[PDB]
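In this section we turn from sequence analysis to structure. A common task in structural bioinformatics is to predict how a protein folds when a small molecule is present, because the ligand can shape the pocket around it. The inputs are simple: the amino acid sequence and a SMILES string for the ligand, here magnesium ion. Study the lines below before reading on.
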Amino acid sequence: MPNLPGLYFLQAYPSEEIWRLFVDGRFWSKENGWRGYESREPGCLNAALESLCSIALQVEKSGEEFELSVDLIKRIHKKCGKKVEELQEKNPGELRTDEPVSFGIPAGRASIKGIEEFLSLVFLTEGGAEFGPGKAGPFGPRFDKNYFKNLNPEQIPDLAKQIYFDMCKYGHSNTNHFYLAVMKNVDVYLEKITQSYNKEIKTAETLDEKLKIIVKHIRMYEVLHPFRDANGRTFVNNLLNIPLMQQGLPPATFYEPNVFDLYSAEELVVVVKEAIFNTVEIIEQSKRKTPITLYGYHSSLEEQTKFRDMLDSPSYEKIKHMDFSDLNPEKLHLKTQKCLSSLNEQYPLHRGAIYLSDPGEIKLLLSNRNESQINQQIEQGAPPIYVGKTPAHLAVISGNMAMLDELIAKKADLSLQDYDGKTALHYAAECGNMQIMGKILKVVLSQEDAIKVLNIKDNHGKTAFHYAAEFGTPELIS
Amino acid sequence: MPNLPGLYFLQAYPSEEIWRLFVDGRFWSKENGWRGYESREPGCLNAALESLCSIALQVEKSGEEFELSVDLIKRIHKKCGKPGELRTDEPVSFGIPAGRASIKGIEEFLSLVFLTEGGAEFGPGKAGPFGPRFDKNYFKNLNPEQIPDLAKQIYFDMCKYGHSNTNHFYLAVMKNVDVYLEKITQSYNKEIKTAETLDEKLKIIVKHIRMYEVLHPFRDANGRTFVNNLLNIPLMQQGLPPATFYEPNVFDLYSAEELVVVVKEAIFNTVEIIEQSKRKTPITLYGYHSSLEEQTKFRDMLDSPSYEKIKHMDFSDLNPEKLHLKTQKCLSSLNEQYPLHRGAIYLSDPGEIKLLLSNRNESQINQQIEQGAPPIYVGKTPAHLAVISGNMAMLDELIAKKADLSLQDYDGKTALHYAAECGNMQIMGKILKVVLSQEDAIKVLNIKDNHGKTAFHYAAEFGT
Ligand SMILES: [Mg+2]
């Protein structure tokens, strides 16, 4: 038997695209893929790759059958925190004791069922964690109200609705609430979660059962937030991939990984599956010598040569150039294909806009669909990228010309705004695609309301042409 | 020992941009500079360069004086064909759109008496599979007393059909081409000796190069032979730089006077090319930002022995500054009539631009230039030209000065149509922000050009 049959997918993953399993897909379009992430903290790209591979290297060939252990976990977060001096806290790879870490969460990174689950985590209650609406400070947030104070667990379903309602009133992408992690017993809870995992994982028989257990526990970790820094990479970009590859699944290439706090375990399974699905299509497209176009980003040959020259990781080289113990580098593949087949099922018009490029397939998919299906906006709980969007919005942000054409043919509503206030037009302007902008405007002008539609403002009070006029000048943070 | 001395400006011309004196400036934006011209005839750039340099190496050498003889004219061609010889009876013809014509130019064309007696044809017609079937030929029973009134009507007729549309055709002379070629040669050498100032000399040079073009003595490559090669010889003989052109194919229906202005700005281009390269300033003329890969591709493709000899020729036997100040004063003619428009084409510095547009009135900022001005200006506002050049700085200041962005040029197109066609999201955005704060926004966005197309029709095609 092997231990990490997943390593197979890691080795198959095309080297010049390996940055994709560390840079969130949401940055690729606007930051020339990996370059923006690289410039904000150079070489973390390697460091992150070196961490995964070196950790996975001392697993697939040791132990008995694997059991998770806190020491491993810490053994992980030793990359990458500062690690530099001086005092008085903390060991650049050790655990928080009383140190307080906090961050905010916008409605678009949350779900009602997710909030319900969050409030239900008992260690947050007894550990002294804080969560609620408030204000962000230079030394912590200032809460207007902390829900973990005097929390009646009978009231959590009603409370979860209210919280979600409040977060939306503030804005889909706006940070209103805040979370301050536990300041008591992190070592205890870290061990509790580890034991829970190793207990439950052994009960699960199917791969879907196992996924549920993996994401449920990875969440608890993240929410637990045991380190001073880099809890997200340490768990979701690194740790999550170990149980995934232990089950013989590929590692995850995420659009937006930062939903392991206020999404529910069930909804996270979906998030991880579509992430996984993304590693599979990366590999397939590269195998078929097809240019990779995911998430509206087209890598230039100069960007690719800059990255492989920059690529530098001994443990990655060892995994790329290894033997194929086997057997089943093809069941491995058929196993994950059956596991991911649950995706196709729900809101396919949106997934089509993201992943489909063949005009014939697209035309077929949109046949027999009604006005409400072609105009459907996906609701809370779906993976972040879908919430509030029509297939049209997603066609524009992917650059899916074929899909946009068919949607226009099917007389889709291009005036509808997603929960950021943006219409298909705001996105076309932001993407700087002259053609898709033109197609949309041709349609908009042949309608009654053309001026009202062109003057639509989003959550920044901006019109589509505000963004258009801004295209190609540089960003402006916070 | 120099004359010709102009060979000084050819050497100064930056090697990796030397294609610019062969590829029309109108192609650069939409054909990645030189690459589109090269792909239609591979090797044609080096052949044109080899022709100019090889022929210029034989002239400065013995001619003292020099003489544009029909022998060198034939030798020029001999280096620009499948073949070196003259036409006898073979018909050669082409069409001309109003935008390549002027009223004064048409007057002059009808006045070329060799076109009347030689049997050349020109009037409204249609394009044939072996020749144009003309509806009228103005050279038949032409009263030369009526040519000023006829020239106005021909121009109006060419405009009714459309600024960029071809209604009128020209079939060249089929009798006595060898005779007329010799007549023009003798006329040139006679008249050039009469002229004293550089402006007088220019008038004579362009007038004769025009006549050489209009008489289409060769089967092929009359343009390359007479305007991209021959024209540069008398120019350099006078100590002027060779000419870089936006659109030069105006040596038929433009007048000699107006062609002087066309050549002056073509020369101005060579001066701006050299200056920008000397200052290490990248080049952004007419809309082509050459990529480093393109430059390397051209540098590797460059291959012309006679060019190499001129690039390493020693012009220590010559005063560059006399030469330089002479062409300086000659070109200081340019930025006077319609100054802005030229600003929109050439100016990139926001400070200079802001200064230039200070205390200009609504009629100056909205001014559309009339027929006879070099092709690129005709019918356009400064705003149109800012958009086609990608002159962001100029467009910004024009918007600040509340320029009218609804005004359409003689192709029916507004600043918006051009922004769509150029595919510039930013300039399109700036324009639309303005248009929507106006009462007439919908009427303006729906403006159709000569092709009945709306700005967004072009936008939706962008990337074809
Ligand atoms: Mg905070």
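Strands of chain A lie at 102-105, 130-137, 140-143, 177-180. As an exercise, try to locate the residues that line the magnesium ion site and compare them with your own expectations.
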